């Protein structure tokens, strides 16, 4: 598939420095949805501001975790059914931490933003549309952990 190679090529760029790029994703994410901030509760405490998150070692671990799950979705872009059950369950984890179903889309905007920024001119509108579908399948699946 063409799509699937696009994602794969585009992804490599980001895969190189996943902490740096995941950092973009999350900054963007809290800029768009600041009510995600207090969901992280490392050592009982809420981050006050977004910049506090970037100073938490646990938060930066979570970014790495995030980017590895995206990795997996990338490896498996042609057959993504194969991560469905993982992701549903990842979804239910997150419903427990308090993420709303609607926050998921914001994560996808944030994910595309992080890509658009990384790829600059390279973020072709085919590239865009492919990610949007990928990450979209990833939430159709993370979203699944809300059921019923
Ligand atoms: C949308 C906002 C998000 C918030 C507020 C959030 C928050 C959390 C929190 C508080 C935890 C548990 C603490 C921890 O392990 O650090 C967690 C776990 C995790 N998150 Fe997120 N998260 C978000 C999005 C995502 C996304 C997009 C992914 C991946 C695509 C992701 C992947 C993970 C994984 C892999 C874990 C470990 C889950 C496990 O116990 O198996 N998170 N997240």
Residue numbers in the entry: 3 to 150
Wording from the paper:
To investigate the correlation between mechanical properties and functional efficiency in proteins, we selected neuroglobin (Ngb), a hexacoordinated heme protein, which is expressed in the neurons of vertebrates and is involved in neuroprotection in hypoxic conditions and protects brain from stroke. Ngb folds like all globins with a bundle of eight helices termed A to H, and a heme hexacoordinated in both ferric and ferrous forms by the imidazole side chain of the distal and proximal histidines (His 64 and His 96 respectively). The structures of human and murine Ngb present a large internal cavity behind the heme, that is connected to the surface through a tunnel, forming a pathway toward the heme for gaseous ligands (O2, CO, NO). Like many recently discovered globins, Ngb is characterized by endogenous heme iron hexacoordination in the absence of external ligands.
The effects of high-pressure on the structure of the F106W mutant shed light on the role of Phe 106 and helix G. This mutant is endowed with an enhanced barrier to heme sliding, as indicated by decreased CO affinity. Between F106W HP-310 and F106W AP, the main segments affected by pressure are the BC and CD loops, the N-terminal segment of helices F and G, and especially the second half of helix H which is shifted by more than 1 Å toward helix G which carries the F106W mutation. The protein mean B-factors are considerably raised by pressure, which could explain why this mutant is more sensitive to pressure than WT Ngb. The residues whose B-factors present a relevant increase with pressure (more than 15 Å2) are mostly located at the back of the protein, while the residues whose B-factors are moderately increased by pressure (less than 5 Å2) are mainly located close to the heme. The effect of pressure seems to be the opposite of what was previously observed in WT Ngb under pressure. There is a shrinkage of its volume between the HP-310 and AP structures by 8%. In particular, the tunnel disappears already at 280 MPa and site I disappears at 310 MPa, while site II remains insensitive to pressure (data not shown). The force constant variation profiles between F106W HP-310 and F106W AP presents four peaks, three of them correspond to residues belonging to the WT mechanical nucleus, and one corresponds to Met 69, which lies away from the main cavity. The HP structures reveal that the flexibility of the extended FG loop is restrained by the presence of a tryptophan at position 106, with no particular flexibility of Val 99.
